[PDB]
């Protein structure tokens, strides 16, 4: 969280939290109910976001659902959208935590090695992740859509 | 370590669950007490030294502990003991901010019981030093925060006994 | 007891790096007589130029007192 | 949906939260000199270098003895590596981590304070422990800090740090044992020495070698060659029987 | 470490014996299989990544191991696991070239059983990952080398169990 | 084989084998164990070799697996890989025989007429065979890979 | 050996051996048969090499077999030739492996400290080894004598 | 061993405290679930053999485990394995009746991890045998008892890993 | 080189070269004339290799020479083949050096950052590099073609 | 540093030239002398200590240099001087193997003239120590290698003067 990241700095210097550190915890926690609402809306529309993300993805790059494609077939496709469902979930976690610690340990550190092994085409995956931003963002107010958008662009960034 | 916001995420991640209504209710129950935790930490931090002094005075010194044959005899050991006291106070303040005792296990209790057995450090006397600092803390922080600060001192003390 | 004051410039030849790093590449500092020397090798064996060396603490003639 | 849900319920969600390296590998910070410019920050750096060398418990008591050292670091006269080295040559280090332990635990403690891990193999204990026997503490410390390993890993500024290493075998668990003992909790030597291994498979019992030896027999005994037949026709296969 | 040849030299050195007929026969039994070991190593090295991929596919993924609660859940741990797999493959290739398992003890097995117990890493599942890579290797290297490669994978796997 | 070819030429000219013919039988038979090893390796990886030829094929010609394509559909693709399995088998036969007699009678003489009837595009079958060369060749030592490669290039040649 | 040395450098880097790191090993395998033969030849004449080395040594350095000499007397001389027998043995080991490796661990690392304790003059041990080179080398063909000579000069080098 | 009720009595006895409100609330929380525990035990006991059969069928047999080289190869070892399974089922039923896992430590887990390492018994495979019996049990006992039975199977399985 | 890589180990341990280190320099240098011949052949056919590599590349992925493609146009194409000419040159350097030191400092360390900036599609580039192997390898004997092939596969590896 | 093989590559790389005929001729001129360089290094290495001893005896000791007031007076400074001598010998052996003097500039000569001026170390006397080791080396290595070893000793000595 902001807490985990920051307290760690306190303990490492053998000290209590600074006025600054205390202030950011206060400003952060004040922004709680809104972040929880952003996660709820997206949790509530998860199946729509994934499915419409999946259509947007295969238009922009179909070849993956074709004879020599990593996602070719009904159960090779059941897995690609499932991975898209995984990342949307992690994005809701990140938004409520206010940073990436959780998103990172769960789904980016090691992701190059995992996908290289599976020879899933990773760079297509970034575009797929990007599509979810477009759908999710259309179910949120301008201000909340931006706040959500940072976490989508992070994942897009980490797969790089 | 983990905190209330983080614990909710890792507890659900292992089940692969979106945060749902039950999760969202837990997180609210943390956020809604958050401002009070911060104020309480600022009181403890800024009275740190006085809390140790008053806790030692009620529960440690003026005793056989500080006399020859006692474990807090010698300036060396007296210094080590109130050094320890500062750790406890400081970490309990972390646990209370985080709203999770996991840091008290990871960085304070693990192996400490046996460490104290190996050096001869009196456990029961150390617990009284913890429960005296709690007593002082609960006065200084007020109605708002008293119960919440108190529990992590109680976590510490049943961790040794 | 004696100290050398040296300037070294060591570039990074594998990987680039991404965060401020300016004291880790071109620095100066007092170094002891006993090492200054085997650190003179570590610097040149990592492809780094050594720019300047000054004695700092001891006397050029020596004989006694040096060893401390 | 259901190809992303567990299959066997994680029914005490918590036991599954904690498996892995642990959290401490990544929930700790690295202090570097070069991004520790300005006074507030510089004090943290310094205070964290007493927690790397000296280790936490006894770094709480440091008050101001090393203060001439700190001024020099503050003023950019010496680098972080010089500060670290010089705090290993001090009498406080020597008193705390050397005078009460056998010379092979002195090497082990020093490995973990200036390098982060535990002794990797046995060709090391031998190297570094035979330089402490020969020349005392300041040569042991001076060597660790001027090695290639320290230089790669830590460079000029970067306070040293605990690395949970992945490779050689047993380095990881040996190190994690050392790391998670408070000062004076246990003072045994963890890596007393590396026991020498043995061999349980004789090498001529392996398949490729074993079959090339059967073939070797056949040829010499049984058969003739490239010299004239008269010479080969009067040969005794056996030699003494 | 030791190989076939140094295994013999050190066994005689401790007796201070010049190499005799029995020794010379052993060394021949190694040299006579040497060219085949080299060819096999070049196949394994150049198919390294595909062997891991096919071994994981038959013995690890599409399972509870990769689904929340499993030890190779998270990109973080999936990466660590196939990293390990590469170690095994690579070292087994060393052992097979050397014609001696001693390197598998010195640099791979020593402490590994307990390291895996301490992290929670599933031992039985790791053995299947080893015996699946063996299966793939034995196809790729052919009649010449199949039995010889295989044994050092079997050495690895009875070293954990 | 090399034997059959040598003999047939001998008998047709009413004569015993030539020094040349005798020499090639000798060189051929000396390569027996090696040729048998080359066939074993490839027999041992047959399922993999067809699944990598088949991917290489459908990337290069996604059309064959397209509306108006001979191999369009799941079972029109299943038969296509089965034909690729047939030809790999014949290639192992050829390698152990040291010539094409067997490969030829079984799978090239009549192949134009067969595939023209089925309306299979012959030159894309030749591509499927190149694709198998590429995979098979990556499982063999340099020297054995070349020896194998001649028989792959023959089949590619005969479909022409 | 050559094998041990190559591998240890490989593993340290944690990457399979290079395609040229498979040239020295190949050279060594061919060399090993010749190398094994040289060691056997040296082994056959061991008693003659030691004895004639011992005469050559005591002429060149009579001081070691004199009142204040480390090898003064019949049994202080007996142990001296036994040490010469030890080093010839290690030289046969070094030749056969193709790498010095085991000889170092067996008889040079620690040798300064051992002989300093016994008060043995190290440089006259180096002379005893040169003397053995001279004898051994006269029982080998030019090419094999050079190959052997490198290992003699190594030991001479390490006692320095 | 201890159950819910004696867990509380001994926790207070060491403090020499008469049972207070907090204690009395805990004991109520046990008594109020008691009738349901009994019904669940009667289902498990009377379906014992079928639970083992269905758990083995989903998680053990039709596999390399039962085919030469496998640990449950031989009638001898197959019998030992399903014998073990019956222990687990039976003791988990005790733990769930008692509402305390202490019996699973005292009479089942203590030394068992190393016993299995020493015989070669595959730990991961045994855990799956435990979590398959849980799956069957949770169907048979119904909404009332499913969560409560389940936890002591989960206690058993994280006790081995 | 092998020298640069190895001497560095000598100097870093403050010592003269080992018997092992000396042996590999000797085996390496013996393999010199052959390596020089491999570089000559490829230098002599550079224009053919590049051009035919460039055709093989654009079939396997044309989109790069299309409206929204990084290499679209005559002078955006004059640069893509020029980069292919660069890498073939570095491959000749590597072959004569017997390792990658030179190849690495000149054209892989920093290559991700360079191409990410240019938004040249890097992964297409790996395939382009692979095509050159196919052409170059068809102008070399089996043994020399393999030796060359290791360096091509390295570059392919480093762009990853 | 650079060596003859490497220098040819970097000298052409800065011009972006394939290796051409002129380049290929240079590299041949190195490879063709390579075996002789190796043999020469093995003689120098294995006679290292004797070369220093004979070079010091002809050019340094039995003199005012080793007497009070002299720079190699005191066991400390005598040790430092023959330590230096070993550096020179060792690095010249590197330069001669590489067939390039660049290492003598990068790791030996850079700043050394002024370092010696600053300590008072006699330059002319050090050059004689270099040219005496060359004299000894040229005898030991023979016709094959004499001229090639010699030049890097001459490089060293005109680098100081
Ligand atoms: C052998 C090493 C050693 C020393 C020296 C030591 C001192 C020591 N002095 C104490 C109190 C005290 N010490 C003093 C001393 C003074 N008041 C003044 O104003 C003067 C400056 C000074 C007398 C010269 C006083 C007044 C107290 C009572 C303070 C209190 O109760 O708050 C106490 C706490 C009472 C107790 O439990 O004994 C200790 C432990 N303990 C040790 O183990
Ligand atoms: C960051 C978390 C952390 C904690 C909590 C910690 C405790 C701790 N207390 C210690 C010693 C000690 N602890 C005490 C404590 C006391 N003496 C008494 O009589 C009282 C009952 C009590 C104070 C209330 C004393 C006297 C020693 C010194 C024992 C000795 O002389 O060796 C030591 C041994 C090393 C040292 O002396 O510093 C540790 C590690 N270490 C840690 O890293
Ligand atoms: C946080 C503040 C900060 C800055 C700004 C900084 C700059 C900086 N640039 C460097 C090198 C360099 N800088 C460049 C820059 C350029 N090359 C060109 O041709 C262009 C004109 C220019 C880019 C527009 C290059 C090419 C090098 C590498 C020099 C070498 O090969 O050693 C180095 C040497 C260490 C290294 O290579 O990383 C530093 C420290 N360091 C810092 O800590
Ligand atoms: C050079 C010899 C060598 C070996 C072999 C080695 C193994 C090794 N595996 C580790 C962790 C691990 N190993 C695995 C392995 C697996 N996960 C699974 O579920 C599968 C059953 C299995 C792969 C087939 C995993 C997931 C971790 C991470 C545990 C954690 O999260 O802390 C660690 C802890 C440090 C780290 O995380 O890197 C070491 C040292 N280390 C060495 O130095
Ligand atoms: C062991 C021998 C030794 C000496 C003597 C020493 C002096 C010294 N004085 C310093 C700074 C300083 N020195 C002073 C001194 C003074 N200010 C005034 O106005 C007065 C005229 C004067 C006191 C009488 C001040 C104010 C600074 C701080 C400058 C700053 O803010 O950076 C610093 C810079 C690092 C630091 O701030 O600590 C050093 C190294 N360092 C050494 O290692
Ligand atoms: C400062 C206090 C201190 C002591 C005493 C000490 C002893 C000690 N002896 C060791 C080994 C050893 N010790 C011996 C001793 C002997 N061999 C025999 O056969 C005799 C019976 C005996 C001599 C009388 C030997 C041979 C080894 C090497 C074992 C090996 O090869 O690994 C080692 C392992 C590390 C190393 O090899 O240096 C230590 C630490 N270390 C210390 O720090
Ligand atoms: C929460 C962290 C996390 C993630 C993300 C994760 C992904 C993951 N994706 C997988 C497969 C897959 N993933 C995909 C995904 C795709 N195919 C494409 O071409 C697209 C680029 C992409 C969809 C956007 C495909 C096609 C497979 C099947 C690959 C195969 O079976 O070889 C598998 C192996 C199947 C399994 O056992 O579940 C895992 C573990 N695992 C994790 O623990
Ligand atoms: C070498 C010692 C040994 C034996 C004998 C052995 C038997 C054995 N028989 C099995 C099944 C079976 N065995 C039978 C046998 C029969 N059905 C009948 O009605 C007849 C009476 C009988 C044939 C004569 C059947 C029908 C099954 C399938 C039962 C099921 O799947 O539920 C299974 C479980 C399937 C498997 O995983 O292999 C084993 C392990 N295992 C061993 O390790
Ligand atoms: C003040 C510190 C200091 C000392 C001690 C010192 C000794 C010293 N002894 C020397 C020679 C010598 N020293 C001796 C001594 C001995 N021969 C024996 O056998 C006995 C064991 C021993 C007499 C007790 C001999 C014989 C030489 C001549 C060796 C030669 O020329 O090769 C030389 C070289 C000749 C010269 O240039 O002076 C020096 C420098 N130099 C110093 O700066
Ligand atoms: C790796 C490359 C390298 C070289 C070559 C090197 C030389 C070098 N020679 C030094 C001193 C010295 N060098 C000498 C050399 C001599 N004295 C004489 O009279 C003779 C003319 C001459 C020997 C032939 C002496 C006597 C000193 C000691 C000066 C002092 O007392 O401070 C020092 C000062 C540090 C120290 O004392 O070790 C260096 C760095 N350092 C290096 O890093």
From TrEMBL, chains A, F, G, I:
GO CC terms of this entry: phycobilisome; plasma membrane-derived thylakoid membrane
One Gene Ontology BP term is: photosynthesis
Entries under InterPro entries matching the protein: Globin-like_sf, Phycobilisome_asu/bsu, Phycobilisome_asu/bsu_sf
Where do the annotations place (2R,3E)-phycocyanobilin 1 binding?
A: 70, 80
According to Swiss-Prot or TrEMBL, what is its membrane topology? Peripheral membrane protein
Say if the entry is tagged with keyword Lipid metabolism: no
Q: Which residues carry this modification: N4-methylasparagine?
A: 70
Assigned keywords, A-Z:
Antenna complex, Bile pigment, Chromophore, Electron transport, Membrane, Photosynthesis, Phycobilisome, Thylakoid, Transport
Primary subcellular site in the record, as a coarse category: membrane
Q: Which residues bind (2R,3E)-phycocyanobilin?
A: 80, 82-83
Which domain of life does the UniProt lineage start with? Answer: Bacteria
Q: Which Pfam families match?
A: Phycobilisome
Q: Where in the cell is it found?
A: Cellular thylakoid membrane; Membrane
| Family stated for the protein in its record | Belongs to the phycobiliprotein family.
Indicate what this protein is called per its UniProt record: Allophycocyanin alpha subunit
What organism, scientifically named, is this protein from? Gloeobacter violaceus (strain ATCC 29082 / PCC 7421)
Query: Which taxonomic lineage is given here?
Result: Bacteria, Bacillati, Cyanobacteriota, Cyanophyceae, Gloeobacterales
From TrEMBL, chains B, E, H, J:
Residues with the modification N4-methylasparagine, per the entry, are 71
* Keyword Transport annotated: yes
Keywords, A to Z?
Antenna complex, Bile pigment, Chromophore, Electron transport, Membrane, Methylation, Photosynthesis, Phycobilisome, Thylakoid, Transport
Superkingdom of this entry's organism? Bacteria
**Main subcellular location of this protein, as a coarse class:** membrane
Pfam families in UniProt: Phycobilisome (PF00502)
User: Example GO biological process term?
Assistant: photosynthesis
Membrane topology per the record?
Peripheral membrane protein
Q: Which GO terms describe its cellular component?
A: phycobilisome; plasma membrane-derived thylakoid membrane
Keyword Membrane (UniProt): yes
> Which residues bind (2R,3E)-phycocyanobilin 1 per the record?
62, 66, 71, 74, 76, 81
SUPFAM superfamilies found in the cross-reference section: Globin-like
> Which residues make up the binding site for (2R,3E)-phycocyanobilin 2?
76-77, 81, 84
Q: Which family does it belong to?
A: Belongs to the phycobiliprotein family.
Q: What is this protein called?
A: Allophycocyanin beta subunit
Source organism of the structure: Gloeobacter violaceus (strain ATCC 29082 / PCC 7421)
Automatic annotation (TrEMBL), chain C:
UniProt family annotation? Belongs to the phycobilisome linker protein family.
**Per the record's keyword annotation, is Membrane included, yes or no?**
yes
Its GO biological process annotations read:
photosynthesis
Taxonomic lineage: Bacteria, Bacillati, Cyanobacteriota, Cyanophyceae, Gloeobacterales
**Keyword Nucleotidyltransferase set for record:** no
Extract the coiled-coil ranges from the record: none
Domain of life according to the entry = Bacteria
Recorded hits in InterPro entries, A to Z, give: Allophyco_linker, Allophyco_linker_chain, CpcD-like_dom
The name this protein carries in UniProt is Phycobilisome 7.8 kDa linker polypeptide, allophycocyanin-associated, core
The membrane topology term of the UniProt record is: Peripheral membrane protein
State its location(s). Cellular thylakoid membrane
GO annotation, cellular component aspect: phycobilisome; plasma membrane-derived thylakoid membrane
UniProtKB/TrEMBL annotation, chain D:
Lineage, top-rank taxon, reads: Bacteria
The alphabetized UniProt keywords are:
Antenna complex, Bile pigment, Chromophore, Lyase, Membrane, Photosynthesis, Phycobilisome, Repeat, Thylakoid
Where found, per UniProt?
Cellular thylakoid membrane
UniProt keyword annotation of Repeat present: yes
Query: Residues in domain PBS-linker?
Result: 11-191
Q: Which GO terms describe its molecular function?
A: lyase activity
- Where does it primarily localize? membrane
Entry similarity comment: Belongs to the phycobiliprotein family. Belongs to the phycobilisome linker protein family.
- Protein's recorded name: Phycobiliprotein ApcE
Q: Which species does this protein come from?
A: Gloeobacter violaceus (strain ATCC 29082 / PCC 7421)
**Shown chain mapped onto the complete sequence:** 723 to 963 of 1155
